[PDB]
A paper describes a structure:
HLA‐E is a nonclassical class Ib HLA expressed by nearly every nucleated cell in the body. The structure of HLA‐E is analogous to classical HLA class Ia molecules: it is composed of an α‐chain with three extracellular domains, comprising the α1‐ and α2‐domains that form the peptide binding groove, an α3 domain that associates with β2m, a transmembrane domain, and a cytoplasmic domain. Expression of HLA‐E on the cell surface is usually reliant on binding of leader peptides from HLA‐A, ‐B, ‐C, or ‐G molecules, typically with the sequence VMAPRTL(L/V/I)L. During normal cellular conditions, HLA‐E presented leader peptides prevent lysis by NK cells via binding to inhibitory NK receptors (NKG2A, etc.). Here, we solved crystal structures of TCRs bound to HLA‐E in complex with well‐characterized peptides from Mtb and HIV, demonstrating divergent binding modes akin to the differences observed for TCRs recognizing distinct pHLA class I complexes.
Although this mutation did abrogate the binding of five HLA‐E‐Gag6V‐specific TCRs, we identified an alternative mutation, HLA‐EF116C with peptides modified with the H4C NNAA (HLA‐EF116C(H4C)peptide), that provided similar benefits to HLA‐ES147C(H3C)peptide in terms of stabilizing pHLA‐E complexes (HLA‐E‐Gag6V t 1/2 = 0.16 h, HLA‐ EF116C(H4C)Gag6V t 1/2 = 9.83 h), but did not substantially affect the binding affinity of the HLA‐E‐inhA, HLA‐E‐UL40, or HLA‐E‐Gag6V‐specific TCRs. To further elaborate on the molecular mechanisms governing the native‐like recognition of our NNAA stabilized pHLA‐E complexes, we solved the co‐complex crystal structures of the inhA:01 TCR in complex with both HLA‐ES147C(H3C)inhA and HLA‐EF116C(H4C)inhA, the KK50.4 TCR with HLA‐EF116C(H4C)UL40, and the Gag6V:02 TCR in complex with HLA‐EF116C(H4C)Gag6V. The crystal structures of the inhA:01, KK50.4, and Gag:02 TCRs in complex with HLA‐EF116C(H4C)peptide confirmed that the NNAA modification stabilized these complexes while maintaining the native secondary structure of the HLA‐Eα2 helix. Clear electron density for the disulfide bond between F116C and the NNAA‐modified peptides was observed, and this was corroborated by MS analysis showing that the covalently bound peptide was the predominant species. The modification did not alter the overall conformation of the any of the three peptides tested, and the interaction interfaces between the TCRs and the pHLA‐E surfaces were indistinguishable from the WT co‐complexes. Structural analysis of TCRs in complex with HLA‐EF116C(H4C)inhA/UL40/Gag6V demonstrated a virtually identical protein‐protein interface for all three antigens, and the artificial disulfide formation was confirmed by both the crystal structures and MS analysis. For HLA‐E‐Gag6V, in line with the TCR binding affinity data, HLA‐ES147C(H3C)Gag6V only generated ∼8% clones encoding a HLA‐E‐Gag6V‐specific TCR, while HLA‐EF116C(H4C)Gag6V generated ∼60%.
Residue numbers in the entry:
A (entry chain EEE): 3 to 29, 37 to 58, 63 to 81, 83 to 110, 113 to 127, 129 to 258
B (entry chain BBB): 0 to 99
C (entry chain AAA): 1 to 276
D (entry chain DDD): 3 to 6, 8 to 30, 36 to 58, 64 to 68, 74 to 195, 198 to 204
E (entry chain CCC): 1 to 9
Write the structure that this text describes.
Amino acid sequence: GVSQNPRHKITKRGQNVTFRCDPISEHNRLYWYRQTLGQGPEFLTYFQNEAQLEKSRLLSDRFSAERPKGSFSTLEIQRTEQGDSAMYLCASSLGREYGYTFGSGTRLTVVEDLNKVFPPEVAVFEPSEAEISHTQKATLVCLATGFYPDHVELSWWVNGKEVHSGVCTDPQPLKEQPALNDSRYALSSRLRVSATFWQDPRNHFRCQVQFYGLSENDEWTQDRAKPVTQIVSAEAWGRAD
Amino acid sequence: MIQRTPKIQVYSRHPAENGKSNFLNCYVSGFHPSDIEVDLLKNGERIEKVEHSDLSFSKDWSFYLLYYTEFTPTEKDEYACRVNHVTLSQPKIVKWDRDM
Amino acid sequence: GSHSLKYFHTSVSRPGRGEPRFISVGYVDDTQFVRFDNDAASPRMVPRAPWMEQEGSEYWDRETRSARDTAQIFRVNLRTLRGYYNQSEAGSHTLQWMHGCELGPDGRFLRGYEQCAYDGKDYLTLNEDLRSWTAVDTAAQISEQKSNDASEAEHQRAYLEDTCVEWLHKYLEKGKETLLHLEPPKTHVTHHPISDHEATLRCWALGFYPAEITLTWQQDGEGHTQDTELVETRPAGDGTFQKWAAVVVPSGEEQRYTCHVQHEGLPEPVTLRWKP
Amino acid sequence: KTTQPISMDSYEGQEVNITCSHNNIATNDYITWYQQFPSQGPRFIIQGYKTKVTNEVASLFIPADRKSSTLSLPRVSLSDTAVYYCLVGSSFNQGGKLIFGQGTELSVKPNIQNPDPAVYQLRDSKSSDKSVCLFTDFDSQTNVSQSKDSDVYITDKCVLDMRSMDFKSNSAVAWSNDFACANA
Amino acid sequence: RMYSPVSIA
């Protein structure tokens, strides 16, 4: 139903951004909300077809919304600030009330400078043979060393197929330097499997971390590798040790 | 589907005094569905400036409009209302009668 | 005394001639006061009474919102049902929707109702309790089960018993000059000879509001009395109404016939008889 | 205007009951409830006025006065871990524009069958210098502590679910980039 | 003041 692109966006504080929302096909109402971490959505503006009706008081006049064709809608934040960093949610409904559906959101992080943006490194840490006896089970850990900002999707890939049984990633991550405002983050995940499955040598285990960062669009004049969007990964075969 | 045949009433706003501006009402009621043709006639000819009310309906779901126009009645001038509707085999004319 | 704020919506599909037609009209008592028609390229709720002419800009915005919402839902409800009744997109069909509240002579809440009709027949009908429905059909029954949740939560209940009544009181105060002025009938009897044996006596009531009226013919003595032809109450076009009642009577017997008229605007009910 | 608890714990099966505050509820206001799973945006679960309404997802009780209203979830699973918001308005004056609380963080820790709280150590497969500690199989009551110094990092608890076999383990992870593999 | 539907058929 309610799709939003991009699903992640980074920007140098001062630059603009323009997310989009595609509502369910017939829904004539389209609403924009704004969620900061561990809060609940604040209404920004809603529409009836092409008509932008109400529009929140507090909402800065950097923020403007558009529904030109009475279908898709774009939200535009000019000359962005830190505070703007939020999950920008879109909703649709058939008139008031009926069918009130939300999107998954657009996660925005606004950074004081692009040199703050780092991809993660990822290593796979093989199971304790102490555990293999004690439990008949084997906990693989995966570790996204240190990255900025929290725009990463960690997936497990056993024999070239994604798996959900036995998995657990962190609710959300921690700061390598929790003092430093814009600390690079680190993220763990588990994948528990039976002893005998890990010990099967022809089983292949891959930890995969998709990182949304920068694009061709983003200029980048620092010595180090340009911290663009990528899938930096880490594998580990079955052994009987 | 329901097709109810229209009920026509032709009449004037005020008691027809010859030579005084008045209004010629045609009142179609009791009909379904909504699509209806209603012209007002002077001497068998179509009157051009004919207004109508906003489509409403009754307790029974029957539609009703009021087609009206300013006219000046005369001894020897024929008036009448023409109504066609899917439910009529041909356009049904009802002559105006100042005593009805 | 009896007052009502009713509202009448008509959706009519137009196979391959653009998207479905929609019209609202709202009445206080017998006086239409608003209208929506989506066939404007900027559709708006507009006034149709002089006492709605100096309203806020927010009022009209809030009503245009409600209206275009209803047009779009009903645009759907037409596709939805076309499905339930397995009908082709060639057939043009009709949805009619009616909702209002009624106060009594004594000023207290008499009844409300919300009513759906597909192709000129009842579909979903809201009951006395304003919580349940009487769906006419296996197909309607589907739409019942989809409307129960809202009316459990007293969506229709609160609108009818409270919101509707609240705004009915407002509109009456807004336009009281005309809405609460009891203009009574101008009443005259006309004589039309049929033959030497007979004549039609016709009893006119003219330029009265509200539209509620009783024209009854009476004859003195024991003799026979031929049926009245009673024409159905009809608008003048200036917001006042007209009715007449006609009797065929024997010639000479004419002075024995007396025509009675009841209407709020009349202190006591009047009798007429043809005055030669 | 809408105040509720900020967060709430529970065990898996243990039937949950969040309750909300709105003394100044309008004559004409609707108790409507939304459920936000982690990462996805919120979705509708239930609406009430005064009658008790029940559904697949939850139930809703509304007392006589109308001041309060209690959301009720059954056989609460891991799934059901989410933020739960309580809204009071009418779509009618509002427009369908929703006003959201801070909500209520619900957590659904598991009924750990046979606790076995070990603290196992993993060698990295590619670079066998660097290594992490895995505190695993603790009792869901356990109070996993943040760090001492800068260069020792400790994650929160984490329930993993081996759907084939059953067993849901709690597990946290610890590492230094001089550091022992205990004392945590 | 008119009523917009909170449900659909």
